[PDB]
Amino acid sequence: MLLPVVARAAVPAIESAIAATPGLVSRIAAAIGSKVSPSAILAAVKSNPVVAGLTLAQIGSTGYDAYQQLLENHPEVAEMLKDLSFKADEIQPDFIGNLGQYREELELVEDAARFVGGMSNLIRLRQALELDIKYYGLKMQLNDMGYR
Amino acid sequence: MLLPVVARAAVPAIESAIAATPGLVSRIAAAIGSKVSPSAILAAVKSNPVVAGLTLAQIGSTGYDAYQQLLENHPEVAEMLKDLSFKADEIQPDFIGNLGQYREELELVEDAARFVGGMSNLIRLRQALELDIKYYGLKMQLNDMGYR
Amino acid sequence: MLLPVVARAAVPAIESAIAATPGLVSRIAAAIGSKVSPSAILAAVKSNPVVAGLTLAQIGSTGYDAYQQLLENHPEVAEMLKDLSFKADEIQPDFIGNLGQYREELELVEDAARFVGGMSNLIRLRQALELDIKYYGLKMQLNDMGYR
Amino acid sequence: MLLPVVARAAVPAIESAIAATPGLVSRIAAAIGSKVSPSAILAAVKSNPVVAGLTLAQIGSTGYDAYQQLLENHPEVAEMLKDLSFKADEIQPDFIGNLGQYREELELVEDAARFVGGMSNLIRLRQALELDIKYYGLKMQLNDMGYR
Amino acid sequence: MLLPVVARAAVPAIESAIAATPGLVSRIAAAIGSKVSPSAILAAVKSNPVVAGLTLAQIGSTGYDAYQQLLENHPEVAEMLKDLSFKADEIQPDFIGNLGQYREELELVEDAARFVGGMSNLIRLRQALELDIKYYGLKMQLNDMGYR
Amino acid sequence: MLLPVVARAAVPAIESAIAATPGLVSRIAAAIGSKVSPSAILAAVKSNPVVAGLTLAQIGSTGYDAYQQLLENHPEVAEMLKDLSFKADEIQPDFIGNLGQYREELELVEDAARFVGGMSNLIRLRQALELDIKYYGLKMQLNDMGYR
Amino acid sequence: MFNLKVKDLNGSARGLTQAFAIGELKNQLSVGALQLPLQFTRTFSASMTSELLWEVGKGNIDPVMYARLFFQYAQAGGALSVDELVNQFTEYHQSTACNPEIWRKLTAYITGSSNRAIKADAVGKVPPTAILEQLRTLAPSEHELFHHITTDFVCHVLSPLGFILPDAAYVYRVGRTATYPNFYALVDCVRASDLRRMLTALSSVDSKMLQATFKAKGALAPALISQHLANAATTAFERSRGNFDANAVVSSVLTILGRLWSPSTPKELDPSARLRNTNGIDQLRSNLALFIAYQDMVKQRGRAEVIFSDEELSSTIIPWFIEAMSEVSPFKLRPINETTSYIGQTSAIDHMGQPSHVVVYEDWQFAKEITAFTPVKLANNSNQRFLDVEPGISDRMSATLAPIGNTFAVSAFVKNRTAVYEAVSQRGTVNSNGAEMTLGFPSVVERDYALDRDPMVAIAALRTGIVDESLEARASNDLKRSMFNYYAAVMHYAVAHNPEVVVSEHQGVAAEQGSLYLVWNVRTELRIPVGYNAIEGGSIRTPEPLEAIAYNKPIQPSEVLQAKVLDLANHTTSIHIWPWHEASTEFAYEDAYSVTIRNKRYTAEVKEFELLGLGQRRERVRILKPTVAHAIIQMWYSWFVEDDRTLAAARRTSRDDAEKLAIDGRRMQNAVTLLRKIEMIGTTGIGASAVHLAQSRIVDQMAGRGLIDDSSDLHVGINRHRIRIWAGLAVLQMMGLLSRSEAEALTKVLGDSNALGMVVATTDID
């Protein structure tokens, strides 16, 4: 059913949100599809972990903490829960065409990348050149003193 | 008897509920079937875990915490506890017939399920189609850049 | 000597009760049989665990917590302490004869018990029959849909 | 030198007692034989555990907690510390002669003890006889119903 | 995905900083390159750890705690994150030449070092000589008493 | 670098001391030899543990806690840190000669010690003799009753 | 697959830790503080056998096995214990035997003649189930298992005379035996010594004399039978009477051992100079299986008491307790080295010495047989139903499964694992943690399938130590009884390879008056400890049986562990009364092989009844589950995806050229050994007939559209290497062996590594 380790934190978290405002109680009753009465949904939470998760998605303010802790002790629901809760991210009309212009550009980076090494290196090497000149002098001088 | 670990936390929870209102004291005395005096039931709680559980069912407000922790302390009382505490869930007159109409429908899902895979997959695949078109364009474009 | 883990909690617990009212100080001095002075008994508590227990029996209000924790770290005294502290439970004049009438009755349950199984089963089976009829219909219908 | 686990609790405990009243600072300086300055003794506490203990004996009010925790992590000092801190318990003039009268009496108990069993048994058996009569009736009746 | 153990602490930490002042929201939106809306960046943090780090660099006041804990559970990002977040340390005009004068000097220490031993030794030996004379007398006297 | 377990506690501890008074900021900048700016030293603390220690020596008020915890997770620096931070203890002019008089005396104790046993024994035996006489009577009497 | 962090043992696996066994739920367990030296040279191991169908109806009595039926009926049946059972048996046996009528009334029925002699010719035949029907009314009981034992008693004395029909038959399944005694399994096996002396009296009645006097004289009254039975049944009633409580035989004799092991036993109660010298304690002193039993004893009772006379009486208890166990029983003493023989160990070593990962696995002999039965009711609303074995379905699969067998042997899995940790690990020490210890126990997952239980509650039983209550008691009773085997099976292993063991006494929290725990002396020759202990002296003393494993060198299992299938074939007629729907899997399958030929999609469906040669789809038949076969494959799947996961986890962070090429060197080399294995399954009898058909549904679907034929120089081969692979899953899918999910991920792994791409690359010359 529901892990006590989770449930310990979970139940009062939900109950707190309910006591905060009634407007959420009707919402979760709609999403989970449970009897609108606050006692009902609280009976459902204990029964199924999948249900417990959807509730904590409906209230993210105070509830985010327990949700993560629920996710820990239950890797099982993690896949299923991820699917049931989903929203299509609104895409910008310009986006896909706007990306089309960078085709020329990214292929240029990856030519520079392969040469240098991993992308991490090139980000470094870029800084080394952009770096102030004095530093090249500094390093030369430490080698002048016989430090390596 | 009663294990001490349960006692440090469990004893004050009940005592608090008693001090809150007298009306519960008479109730638990009836359910557990113990002498109405608050000192009596408190002597019984320590003695048997099964008894301790029924008390915590009578008061769920403050008491729910210890109850769960009692589940961990004694496997046996909880096992014989689930039976002693039971209430017939009131059934709606419409329900069983109302379910009869979905016979046609669920058999349709399970035809679609088996084809795709586990129910988890079909919930995903359903979203993939319902998903906005631009995304299909987006993914095609990343493959155009040689990313995949 | 008294173990520190206990003593840490024990000593201030007793001292608090003393500071609450003097009337207890005379009582514990009588029961433990120690010098009436509050400094004396507090010197005795540290010395012997058995003594420490009897004190915590005399004051159960604030003291019950430490007592249990004393009981944990000392299973040794547990037997001895249980004996030294005892009170004959007042028996009701009606009781033993009142029990005589149930001889006929309990032997009836145990005939029903053995048949069914453990007492736990019979408590269940009793509910199954007492249960509303619709449920028998419900379960039949799920089997009609091919669910096991 | 002093283990941190102790020192963490120990140092502020002492420092608190110092800040409470100056009168203790002069006392501990005398007992430990350290420079009267509060900074000095605090430098000594960190240096030697044996010294740390004697300080916590001088102040028992707030300090008793750390002392026990010091005693845990250092079983070594436990012997030495017990010796350095000692006070002859004032004996009552009547006591030793007053004990002489019980010679006749205790030898009587130990004759009764050996017969019964361990002292724990005799304390029980004594109660069984002192116990009210009805109980003997009660137990006989349960055997009448065929319970054992 | 971001590990929960981190995310638990991370999310409210960021959200707190946002609620503190709006001026940061625009900054992080610029650095991470995300939609200016506070809900957007909070959606990004959960998605990528690398992103989560850059945010916590932008706010160091309240956020430093989680950042380190992020760094623990993710040694992977540690390299990449270190590169993306970088600032050229302003160098003083005098510095490199000012260092040139110590060439003569440091070579003198390392002549003394090798002779004595590790640098740690020489720091000690230097103190031993600088030390007051009486101490040499003190140590001689303990040897006079036959102490070693 | 500095281990997080330490750093978690260390960083805010230092930052708190800085916010308390500016006068320390200039001091630590002198001792560690770092840029006077509070942001600079805080950048140094994270970088090297040895540096982190010297800072916590400069502020002992609030900082002593973390320092010890730093010492735990880093036994390495423990040697090096002990050397870099040192102060010659001012010696009293009278001391060494004042010790010369006890030569005669201590050699007397060690003659008594060897005879008895370890020094711990002699401290006990000394008390046994100093102890009141009645006790010798008491013990004799318990043996008279046949107790050992 | 079960992973534990050996550094923190308490948290990761509390089931196998010793701290749990003696009652410490809290973290603390005493160090090597106080000690006494000891050597365990013997143990009680159950004989190596698993459940078999045995039939109760026929006239024989085989006392050992009826005894075994009581174990199962009472214990796993949900009832309290076999002890309470047997007691209610001898109140039942006293009822009939000591009662003069009940032996007349049912000899009036079987002989037919109340008041007069019966001739020699006129002897009718009464079927065994008959007399049972009436004995039910005469001597009623709540346990049918008693009536069967009396019924086939009278059948045994009357068999020579021929008053009863032989033909009728009937059958039950005896249960599986725990390899090591739980505390109660001692108490049981002591009562079952009584019982076995009971039945050996009933069983041995010849009634040859009654057969002789019947022949010569020509006739005999019921007065001769009905006495001659009553003489037998009261010889058995003698032998029951006056045996000691098992509960107090053992409770004592595990205490008075427990006092001569523990070093700290107060002198106030010391086992005396005589009983210490008793014949037989010497041997029982050095025995292990008792010890871990003792640890259990105190775990529950919390205490102990010696009721029996500390001297005169307790020296006739032991010689009686020895004779109970020592005699042939399920438990037979063996030298300790042998009972752990099948466990084996291998480790992944750093450069210095110490473990990085160390694996412990149970070797297996894969079971190559399978049977398929069809259930047949006797009458509507009657549960008697008896199955018919059908050959020709089973001959297919067992000739299909036999090729699978050779190639999955367990040793080849770990021999593969350590080859992973060679490649993935950096060059540097492991100080960061104790070396994690992975342990394959195919027996665990195996027991989950025959009992139909979520693998997640089984594992999580070992981790936290407590059993979930949500499940019904039939599982928990076989779950805990299981979880105790592994605990025991661990310590027999640890002790076998570290003969030096030392017995302390735990009293830190003062939970019980008497307690015991071993501490091992193992000499590590390592610089840094794994787990946590001071590693001082060039030997480490570790209370945990797991840690004391980790310091072992590699061990090769000397004895294959043997699963064996339940056997339906032998007795066909007998009616099955045991539920067989637990061990039966439904058998049905559907699948579609899709290929794309010249820019279209062609899908060949296929059904299981076609694969088997059956022309029609028959619903009834049910494959009897291939558990141990599904156990192994389940293991080999989880270790495969685990490997292939851990590499692609390092492969990202490698940051080396020399090493990175060694990872992709591994994956590819792994995945194409994966595939050459599945292709090897495709040539099998089901694999064949799956292929022959799939190509044929694809052909006739292309009839309409004329398109050009292939080269098949390599194309016949390329197409061939692909279609086989899909047979390889189809055969695994249709039998239980591989679940549909994991079959998909196993395609995806073989999919992205482009294994097939590399397989063909060896069939061309350039």
Give an overview of the whole structure.
This is part of a larger assembly, with six copies of chain A (148 residues) and one copy of chain G (766 residues). Chain A is mainly alpha-helical and 148 residues long. Chain A folds into two domains: 85 residues, no CATH class; 55 residues, no CATH class. Chain A has ten helices and no strands. In chain A, helix 3 packs across helix 4 and helix 4 crosses helix 6. The longest helix of chain A has 17 residues. Chain A starts with a helix and ends with a helix. The relative contact order of chain A is 0.09. With 766 residues, chain G is α+β, with helices and mostly antiparallel strands. In chain G, strand 16 and strand 17 form a beta hairpin. Chain G has one domain. The longest helix of chain G has 27 residues. Chain G is flat, with a radius of gyration of 32 Å. Chain G contains 29 helices and 18 strands. In chain G, helix 4 runs antiparallel to helix 10 and helix 18 runs parallel beside helix 24. Chains in contact: A-B, A-E, A-G, B-C, B-G, C-D, C-G, D-F, E-F. Chains A, B, C, D, E, F: It is found in: Virion. Chains A, B, C, D, E, F: This is Major outer capsid protein. Chains A, B, C, D, E, F: Homotrimer.
How is this fold's topology laid out?
The structure is cut from a larger assembly and holds six copies of chain A (148 residues) and one copy of chain G (766 residues).
Chain A: H1 4-20, H2 23-33, H3 38-47, H4 49-58, H5 64-73, H6 75-84, H7 95-100, H8 103-116, H9 119-130, H10 134-144
Chain G: E1 3-4, H1 9-12, H2 18-21, E2 37-38, E3 42-46, E4 53-54, H3 63-76, H4 82-97, H5 102-111, H6 128-138, H7 144-158, E5 170-173, H8 183-203, H9 208-217, H10 222-240, H11 246-253, H12 255-261, H13 281-285, H14 288-300, H15 314-326, E6 331-335, H16 336-339, E7 343-349, E8 355-362, E9 372-374, E10 388-389, H17 394-407, H18 411-424, E11 436-440, H19 442-450, H20 455-464, H21 473-497, E12 501-504, E13 517-520, H22 547-550, E14 575-576, E15 584-586, E16 590-596, E17 601-607, H23 608-611, E18 622-624, H24 627-653, H25 657-681, H26 685-699, H27 715-734, H28 740-752, H29 755-760
Parallel strand pairs in G: 5-14, 8-11
Antiparallel strand pairs in G: 1-11, 2-12, 3-6, 4-5, 7-8, 9-10, 9-18, 12-13, 15-18, 16-17
Helix pairs in contact in G: 3-8, 4-10, 5-6, 5-10, 6-7, 8-10, 8-11, 11-12, 11-15, 18-24, 19-24, 24-25, 25-27, 26-27
